[PDB]
Design a protein around this nucleic acid. Structure first.
Ligand SMILES: NC[C@@H]1O[C@H](O[C@H]2[C@@H](O)[C@H](O[C@@H]3[C@@H](O)[C@H](N)C[C@H](N)[C@H]3O[C@H]3O[C@H](CO)[C@@H](O)[C@H](O)[C@H]3N)O[C@@H]2CO)[C@H](N)[C@@H](O)[C@@H]1O
Ligand SMILES: [Mg+2]
Ligand SMILES: [Mg+2]
Ligand SMILES: [Mg+2]
Ligand SMILES: [Mg+2]
Ligand SMILES: [Mg+2]
Ligand SMILES: [Mg+2]
Ligand SMILES: [Mg+2]
Ligand SMILES: [Mg+2]
Ligand SMILES: [Mg+2]
Ligand SMILES: [Mg+2]
Lengths: 125, 118, 50, 203, 106
RNA sequence: AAUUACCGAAUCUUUGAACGCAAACGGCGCAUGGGAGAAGCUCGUGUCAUCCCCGUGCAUGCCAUACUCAGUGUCGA
RNA sequence: ACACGAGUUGUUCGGAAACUGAGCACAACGUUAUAUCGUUUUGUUAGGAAAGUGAAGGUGGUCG
RNA sequence: AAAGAAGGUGUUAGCCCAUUGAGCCAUAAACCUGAGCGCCUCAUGAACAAGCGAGUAGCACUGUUUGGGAAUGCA
RNA sequence: AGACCUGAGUGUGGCAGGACUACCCGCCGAACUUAAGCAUAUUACUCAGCGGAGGAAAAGAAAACAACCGUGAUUCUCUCAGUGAGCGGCGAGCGAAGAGGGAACGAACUCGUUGCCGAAUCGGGUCUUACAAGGCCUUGAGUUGUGGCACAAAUAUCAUUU
């Protein structure tokens, strides 16, 4: 029956997606009254296709909010006020670890000795 | 500073700056229109419930257990175009919260309960 | 008595909703194992003590 | 050089001038807290020897420990069993107080990786040690090649495991030859090695 | 080679005087007697030992001859295989070249 | 628009190191923002007093930092 | 007992919001190899700058 | 049969089924390849008389630890 | 007035806290047992207790072994060696190291000091597709010293354009 496919659901705006969310929370709420007052097994039984299509509208609304907010903090030099829900979640230990732009830092002498005496490729016969 | 008239040195009040308001910490939509479908769940249809619709004026619903009586009245206005004058909530031994909702005597209880359908 | 915390009332409410038998159509599935409920608590035999 | 005058002045610790300065210092240190942060180290010649630089993420704390031996904490001095284990007062801890001072800093200020400390001053009751710590999240410390090793998470509490200089003292790792054969790399690393009943396969 | 070149050193303790084995590295006097920079020799496959003292000329000349043999077998590929910089391979040598798994470098 | 397996995008109640304060309390704050609002006021709309919801900031210690201070500490006009 | 279906309605009732008591022990401070230890109401924390409240007045839109 | 492989199927399966090979297809980074390969930018290899770790080491007493004994290590 | 020093208060950006804990590092630390009793000794520098990491940890680059024709960081293995070592009511019992055959191994480097330089440094801004080992700017730290060059594998300093 009524079943929001997501391909025709990602082309909606933020206002029409909310207007069809109130449409489908309302249709679920007036099937919770037929689930308590008897209920034919055909009218009841549209409880999964509504409740999983509410889950499709909310995952289009939420994936369009993180997309339009990740492209609000990586745009410029505002990346110190980026909220931590939008940052790259790794292991806790991997965020504190030395990045590889760091950790290969070396002395002016340590650069010289790898330039004055570099490791040669060679063979033997 | 100067003019120390008390026997002990209490802390002088420096200038103290307010804290910045952060932009956001939640990335999730929350529709204010669907927000009262979680307050009101479904009506009861028991024998004590059917008697109170006819004889007193009241309607009976399972509501969510973490709502107060004020926000149940406001959900019985936006969902159902009726006026609640009195809500008497009750957390059941089942674990659910049941509300008895008396209408304003400008609104018929059966005319609302046919539109809901029960 | 009358005094209970609501967190004790909501634990006592879960055990009332668990004290229901196995339905009959469970006994008709393919790889069935369950005849009876093995956890039917009675208020006199065994005490929860919440 | 300027170090050589500072270093040889701190070898004259018993002379009348350095006994005056340590007199004043030991007065004003026992009217401070157990753990005190300084802007600059009290001995800059000995702090930089030991690893401190006047960089951004380095920081020095002066830590106080009490002197004397270890009273065994048995109840009422009553202990049981064999008479060799009966002593309460003459027993002595197997960690020096410099290590104990470094562990009291780093168990208290958890976000800081302490490297080693040094002796500052004695009293009849207390000893003081400036413990050099370093902030591993400071951008100066992460980008600097000769100190960025401290940011790696194997150095998290070097003090609690005996990896500082004062830790390596009470482990016996000042010695290498026949004077340390029972204790290289560890006493437990040699106990396990010398006592595990090896079962060769074909035997 | 899978294993770098190691010197021939004697064995200590008069039980083992008449024996020889492979040392840690060539001293920086056997290397200079072979006309070879010790910092440069570590890149072209030679182990170097700054600690060993060379207390006789027979034990020094054995390991110089190991270095003189090794450099004549050495091929030493170019950095840039178009612009050859020094005495290096000539790509008829940088294509016929092989390695050993001879378990000692011998 | 099957179903299953896998995984990158998300959701993830109340708690718990648990950290606004508490706690056999589904309890109570101080700033701040949003909401709903049948009394009022407005020329039924707006606006909306308390009341009532919802988000965020706020444990403590420390490191770095950019402003307000204390000191018969040493100076200095 | 067993199965099924119900049943606990609050401005004022009891509690909390919101009291103090015997006491407890968070912060602070000290101790301890170790905090999982001590002190913490005899008016009362802490070598101990823990009051963020504001009388009166000055500054300039409102009511006699 | 380059496949005999050992699981399933109503009763003992190489032939009933799945398997058991050569290889095909698709890949966020990372990994590996004349330190893969260009461009920009940026570094820079080779040519042309002084001293070196001080409440430290040691020593004494005590305590412990060790095969370490006129004292192995430590406090 | 102002400064410097030593301390506060807030703002901003961060971090520590608990879990696991087989192995590993630091401490703490027994007794039953054995000695045909038992107290030294043994069990055992083990169990239990407390703290702390990692994918391993710890060790590691000679204030080493040797006494040789010498060896050459650490770790591990077989052996040394249940020892004509040693310790021990010299009782019960305990207990190694060097050498040699191997595993691994591109294995080495960084400060401090000294000498020569002296902010050439670091952080924040900002501009280059860029939180550049880039420019340019900053009293913000810093001269109570950040950085560079040389120090046994050494043959030394600055230029510069090839
Ligand atoms: N026959 C009795 C059994 O012997 C078994 O062990 C027997 C053998 O397995 C064991 O042999 C051991 C060998 O396993 C171990 N890996 C090394 C040892 N060299 C051998 O021992 C051998 O040499 C010794 C003298 O050196 C002889 O006394 C002994 O008889 C001989 N088997 O010695 C025992 C003599 O037969 C078990 N210990 C046990 O099941 C049981 O006591
Ligand atoms: Mg050994
Ligand atoms: Mg809480
Ligand atoms: Mg019953
Ligand atoms: Mg001494
Ligand atoms: Mg922990
Ligand atoms: Mg036993
Ligand atoms: Mg017996
Ligand atoms: Mg244990
Ligand atoms: Mg390591
Ligand atoms: Mg320097």
């Amino acid at each position: 029956s009524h079943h929001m496919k997501i391909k025709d659901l990602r082309e909606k705006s933020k206002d029409d997606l909310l207007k069809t969310l109130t449409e489908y929370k309302k249709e679920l709420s007036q099937l919770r009254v037929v689930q308590q007052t008897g209920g034919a097994e055909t009218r009841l039984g549209r409880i999964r296709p509504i409740r999983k299509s509410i889950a499709r509208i909310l995952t289009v609304l939420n994936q369009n909010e993180r997309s339009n907010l990740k492209m609000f903090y990586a745009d410029r030099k505002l990346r110190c006020k980026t909220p931590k829900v939008l940052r790259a979640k790794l292991t806790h230990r991997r965020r504190l670890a030395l990045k590889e732009n760091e950790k290969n830092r070396k002395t002016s002498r340590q650069m010289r000795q790898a330039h004055k005496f570099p490791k040669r490729v060679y063979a033997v016969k | 500073a100067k003019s120390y008239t008390r026997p002990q040195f209490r802390r002088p009040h420096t200038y103290r700056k307010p804290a910045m308001a952060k932009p956001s910490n939640r990335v999730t939509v929350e529709s204010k229109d669907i927000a009262a479908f979680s307050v009101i769940r479904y009506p009861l249809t028991t024998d004590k419930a059917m008697k109170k619709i006819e004889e007193n004026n009241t309607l009976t619903f399972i509501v969510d257990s973490r709502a107060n009586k004020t926000e149940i009245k406001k959900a019985m206005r936006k969902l159902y175009q009726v006026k609640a004058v009195k809500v008497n909530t009750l957390i059941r031994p089942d674990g659910l919260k049941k509300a008895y909702i008396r209408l304003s005597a400008a609104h018929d209880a059966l005319d609302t309960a046919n539109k809901i359908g029960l | 008595g009358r005094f209970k915390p609501l967190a004790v009332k909501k634990k006592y409410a879960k055990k009332m909703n668990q004290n229901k038998p196995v339905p009959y159509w469970i006994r008709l599935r393919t790889g069935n194992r369950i005849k009876w409920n093995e956890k039917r608590r009675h208020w006199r035999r065994t005490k929860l003590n919440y | 050089g300027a170090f050589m005058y500072l270093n040889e002045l701190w070898k004259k610790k018993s002379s009348d001038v350095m006994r005056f300065i340590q007199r004043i210092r030991s007065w004003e240190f026992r009217h401070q807290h157990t753990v005190v942060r300084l802007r600059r180290p009290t001995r800059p010649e000995k702090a930089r020897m030991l690893g401190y630089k006047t960089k951004q993420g380095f920081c020095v704390f002066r830590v106080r420990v009490r002197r004397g031996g270890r009273k065994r904490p048995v109840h009422k001095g009553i202990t049981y069993g064999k008479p060799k284990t009966s002593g309460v007062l003459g027993m002595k801890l197997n960690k020096n107080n410099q290590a104990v001072a470094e562990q009291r800093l780093g168990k208290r200020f958890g976000n800081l990786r302490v490297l080693n400390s040094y002796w500052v001053n004695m009293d009849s009751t207390f000893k003081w040690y400036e413990v050099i710590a370093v902030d591993p999240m400071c951008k100066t410390i992460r980008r600097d090649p000769r100190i960025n090793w401290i940011v790696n998470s194997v150095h998290k509490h070097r003090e609690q495991r005996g990896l500082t200089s004062a830790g390596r003292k009470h482990r016996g790792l000042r010695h290498k030859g026949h004077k340390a054969s029972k204790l290289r790399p560890s006493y437990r690393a040699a106990w396990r090695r010398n006592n595990r009943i090896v079962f060769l396969r074909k035997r | 080679p899978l294993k770098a070149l190691r010197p021939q050193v004697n064995c200590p303790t008069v039980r083992h005087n008449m024996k020889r084995r492979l040392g840690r590295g060539f001293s920086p006097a056997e290397l200079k007697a072979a006309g070879l920079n010790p910092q440069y020799a570590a890149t072209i496959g030679i182990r170097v030992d700054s600690r060993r003292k060379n207390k006789s000329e027979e034990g020094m000349n054995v390991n110089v001859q190991r270095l003189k043999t090794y450099m004549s077998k050495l091929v030493l590929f170019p950095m840039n295989h178009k612009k050859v910089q020094k005495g290096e391979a000539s790509e008829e040598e940088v294509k016929a070249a092989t390695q050993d798994r001879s378990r000692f470098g011998d």
